[PDB]
């Protein structure tokens, strides 16, 4: 009887391990994907922020020259 629980737990834990590990692989792949996307988006929003800054200085120059 002690042995049937041993084996029963072994089988259940083995299948649970497979499911948990496949879940880990997919979670890791999604993490890598989304991290790369986040890095690209951060670079792009840095670009857009500096560009907006550029727009601001040039606008200032235009308004002083017009005055």
């Amino acid at each position: 009887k002690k042995l049937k629980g041993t084996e029963d737990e072994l089988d259940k834990y083995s299948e649970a391990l497979k499911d948990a590990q496949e879940k880990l692989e997919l979670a890791e792949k999604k993490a890598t994907d989304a991290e790369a996307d986040v890095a690209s988006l951060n670079r792009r929003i840095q670009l857009v922020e500096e560009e907006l800054d550029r727009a601001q200085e040039r606008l200032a120059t235009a308004l002083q020259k017009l005055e």
Partner: protein, 375 residues
């Protein structure tokens, strides 16, 4: 090891060591600067029984080691500790031999010249690096930002440095070091948590509470009003799940901890907040470029991963300085690696090998040659 003889790039930042190869985008071996030693003596056998423990090994073995800092605020305790940790980094972590690769190192701002002379001498005797170069982390963070104008706020774990650089030139006359850093943050949080009922002294809880600072801490927009509304604040109060499983709840402390750098009078510093240190730094130099300094301020360091520094920074500087020109901060994500990136940038160009500090120059003029070879 790469087939090419490319250089080593190592940032020995005050709080983290990040090492790797030149031409790489990120350092390969990154570890905190804690060092663990056996808390007791040897009677057992069959395993362990090793003196120095560094890196993730010590992180896993924090509880049975006395955790000591070979460097604190730049001061050097024992060069043997650096010898061992560099051995570990080069061979056990980087899997590289320093014989065939020159090393580019970064040092804390305004580090002692005697410290540089001793560290370089022990390095050259102990190791067999072909060539050398050491630079201040300020210009490295500048290189990471890639803009020659700005004031760098380097917030390490031992010192916070404010350094202005205009059009890629250093301004030592307007550079200052403040003794507030991660250590102070942990200390202050320790005393507040003591007033919350939890009183610990050991370093494991130090790392736990710095992790809490990494996760939950705020930078208060308005201080006394936020404790006034944080009196009850069921929603605003935030909790953490400590690894043992207990739920530890913290409210106003989240934004009352980083505030101490801004408000040093809490634990007794004559120097005012770090924004005052950036302000004075700015006015020390000629008036005209000050506006550009206002608009080109950069912040660097591992602490910068926290929220709230940017908004507080701009608002207080605008309060202190006239609000005509718009002030904006720039801070790329994961900027604690940025210094190391700049090191790679230094090795990128072909002029860098014109001023490698070779072995024979040191053999001729001793360590003193660096006094003429770096600056």
């Amino acid at each position: 090891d790469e087939d090419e003889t490319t250089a080593l790039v190592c940032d020995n930042g005050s709080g983290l060591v990040k090492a790797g190869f030149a031409g790489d985008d990120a350092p390969r071996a990154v570890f905190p600067s804690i060092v663990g030693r056996p808390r007791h003596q040897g009677v057992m056998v069959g395993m362990g029984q090793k003196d120095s423990y560094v890196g993730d090994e010590a992180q896993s073995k924090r509880g049975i080691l006395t955790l000591k800092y070979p460097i604190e605020h730049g001061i050097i305790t024992n060069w043997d500790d650096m010898e061992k940790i560099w051995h570990h980094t080069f061979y056990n972590e980087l899997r590289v031999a320093p014989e065939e690769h020159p090393t580019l190192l970064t040092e804390a701002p305004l580090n002692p010249k005697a410290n540089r002379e001793k560290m370089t001498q022990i390095m050259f005797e102990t190791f067999n690096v072909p060539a050398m170069y050491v630079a201040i982390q300020a210009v490295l963070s500048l290189y990471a930002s890639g803009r020659t104008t700005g004031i760098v706020l380097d917030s390490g774990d031992g010192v916070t440095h404010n350094v202005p650089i205009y059009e890629g030139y250093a301004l030592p006359h307007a550079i200052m070091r403040l003794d507030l850093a991660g250590r102070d943050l942990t200390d202050y949080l320790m005393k507040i948590l003591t007033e919350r009922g939890y009183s610990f002294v050991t370093t494991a809880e130090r790392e736990i509470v710095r992790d809490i600072k990494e996760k939950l801490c705020y930078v208060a927009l308005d201080f006394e009003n936020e404790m006034a509304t944080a009196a009850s604040s069921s929603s605003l109060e935030k909790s953490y799940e400590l690894p043992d499983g207990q739920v530890i709840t913290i409210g106003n402390e989240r934004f009352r901890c980083p505030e101490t750098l801004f408000q040093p009078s809490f634990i007794g510093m004559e120097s005012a907040g770090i924004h005052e240190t950036t302000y004075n730094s700015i006015m020390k130099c000629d008036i005209d470029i000050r506006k550009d300094l206002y608009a080109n301020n950069v912040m660097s360091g591992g602490t910068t991963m926290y929220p709230g520094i940017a908004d507080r920074m701009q608002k207080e500087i605008t309060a202190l300085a006239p609000s005509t020109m718009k002030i904006k901060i720039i801070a790329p994500p994961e900027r604690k690696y940025s210094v190391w990136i700049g090191g790679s940038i230094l090795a990128s160009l072909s002029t860098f090998q014109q001023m490698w500090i070779t072995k024979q120059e040191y053999d001729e003029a001793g360590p003193s040659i660096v006094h003429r070879k770096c600056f």
